[PDB]
Design a protein around this ligand. Structure first.
Ligand code: NZL
Ligand code: NZL
Lengths: 150, 149
């Protein structure tokens, strides 16, 4: 559970926002990309895995599951690549709600930045610091620290 | 100390590698950029601060210290912008050693990637996971968790 992440792809302003959610905490990382390709997804995963201990990634769709570049990145970074089939059906709804929330925050900050990528990073900041009580940022750190003492 | 970061700028293949070091742990984040501008530095800081609890940043030079865009990012993200004057003189050497180490790792992986940015992210991964004994990645998490508790 401490090492499980979920990829998620949402759209805004004719661009793609690629999101990784740390399942146990709700902490996220995100980037704006022109289109969701294997190469973009692979590069995003490499960045993520150098920053947090990524053990398992539930890919967002079958194309990224299949992509040889994504498999190469997962091999390189020691990540177990899994599907994202919501065997637990509440997962689809949680992700959809998260996407709606992110789009809302982006809208609230959009005017403070010239570029969408900047607004998305502002939204990541706000999401991860939001007290809901601990923040997602506090939760991921706690969860991983607890795991290390084991 | 748990919230203190140091910016660092090094060069390779006619490009710029911008690095943030978490001082207490030695954990790093890094990106390749065409040139070190206020705008690049500001954007990098926004990314960093949304991901880790950045309280204080020791800027890498006076231009980024002065940049109004960098100040805007630090204001926005709630970061205290400080200079990077090594009042403690061992700081220059530690950073220089880190840059050398990173360039070495980059060289070791360079052939596995078409693009420099990919090699740099591989080097970040290796640096943060390297057991010295705990890894830098384990140390940053421990330090911040202790601070929360
Ligand atoms: N020079 C001879 C070797 C060239 C082999 C290229 C090759 O398949 N490496 C993989 C191995 C590997 C392993 C993990 C991550 C990336 C990569 C690379 C793929 C890659 C993917 C996405 C990107 C990239 C590159 C890049 O290649 O940089 O750049 C920006 O987004
Ligand atoms: N209604 C439009 C008003 C325009 C205000 C522009 C403005 O100063 N925002 C700051 C506020 C703010 C606060 C923190 C970080 C960035 C920014 C933004 C600066 C910025 C910097 C670097 C970048 C950017 C943009 C960007 O502006 O996206 O893009 C990629 O690298």
């Amino acid at each position: 559970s401490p090492g499980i992440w979920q990829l998620d792809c949402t759209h805004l302003e004719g661009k793609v926002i690629l999101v990784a959610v740390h399942v146990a905490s709700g902490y996220i990382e995100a980037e704006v990309i022109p289109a969701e390709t294997g190469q973009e997804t692979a590069y995003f995963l490499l960045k993520l895995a150098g920053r947090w201990p990524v053990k398992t990634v539930h890919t967002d769709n079958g194309s990224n599951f299949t992509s040889t570049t994504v498999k190469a990145a997962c091999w390189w970074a020691g990540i177990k690549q899994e599907d994202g089939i919501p065997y637990n059906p509440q997962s689809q709804g949680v992700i959809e709600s998260m996407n709606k929330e992110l789009k809302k925050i982006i809208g609230q900050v959009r005017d403070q930045a010239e570029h969408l990528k900047t607004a998305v990073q502002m939204a990541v900041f706000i999401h991860n610091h939001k007290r809901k009580g601990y923040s997602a940022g506090e939760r991921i750190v706690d969860i991983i620290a607890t795991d290390i003492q084991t």
